């Protein structure tokens, strides 16, 4: 999928989250997130001029969504262990990587 | 300093930006945070086993207090033009980069 796609997947699965009621329904939508992580994660930034991968600020954007991994699967080992509200609060906790990002590329 | 002192510098100022009535305290304030930040920039991780400035972690570490310092200079444009609630509120948006760099090194 494109950057938006990619983004709009992590936007509403973030939501659903927060919405959900049981183990199945966090852990399927961090799944989901997961995916669109690693896919969005072969992309480049479109305000960044430079887009030679082995620049340091495209090896900035490609570790951006390696951190963002580990923090899905730090939230999927509390859904898997049937912990929903601390999985919930796990995903809370993904804004702060989202945000920066944005902040700093866009 | 050393990176505690350098911390609740941030921290301690963050707050002073939060309570301020005038310009002239969140320029102050921000003035501050500024040296904390290029002087904490100088310092390692505790937990990062390796500490070679080369090595691509310390690039991220280092580069994590440029985007922060950026993010102050931001604010700064808008205390000295006058905008208290805009500076704080770019203020407040300095959070996720603290929280970030938290998550990943602490
Ligand atoms: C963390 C869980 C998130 C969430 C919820 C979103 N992102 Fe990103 N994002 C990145 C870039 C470069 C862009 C710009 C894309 C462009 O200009 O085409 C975006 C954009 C978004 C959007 C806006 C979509 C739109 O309609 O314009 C949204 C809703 C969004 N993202 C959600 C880059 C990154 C990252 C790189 C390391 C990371 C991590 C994230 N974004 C994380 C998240
Ligand atoms: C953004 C404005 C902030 C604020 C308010 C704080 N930081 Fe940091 N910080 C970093 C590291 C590696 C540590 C660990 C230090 C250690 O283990 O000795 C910290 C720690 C803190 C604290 C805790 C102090 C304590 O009593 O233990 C606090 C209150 C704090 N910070 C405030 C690293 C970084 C960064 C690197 C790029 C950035 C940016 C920030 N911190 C940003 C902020
Ligand atoms: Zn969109
Ligand atoms: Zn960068
Ligand atoms: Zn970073
Ligand atoms: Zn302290
Ligand atoms: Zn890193």
Chains 1, 2 share one sequence.
């Not at 049981?22 to 992309?43: F, G, I």
């Not at 898997?80 to 609060?89: D, I, L, S, Y």
């Amino acid at each position: 999928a494109d950057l938006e796609d990619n983004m709009e997947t992590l936007n509403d699965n973030l939501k659903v989250i927060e919405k959900a009621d049981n183990a199945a329904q966090v852990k399927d939508a961090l799944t989901k997130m997961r995916a669109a992580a690693l896919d969005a994660q072969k992309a480049t930034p479109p305000k960044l001029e430079d887009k030679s991968p082995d620049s340091p600020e495209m090896w900035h954007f490609r570790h951006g969504f390696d951190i963002l991994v580990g923090q899905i699967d730090d939230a999927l080992k509390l859904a898997n262990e049937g912990k929903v509200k601390e999985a919930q609060a796990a995903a809370e906790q993904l804004k702060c990587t989202c945000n920066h990002c944005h902040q700093h590329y866009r």
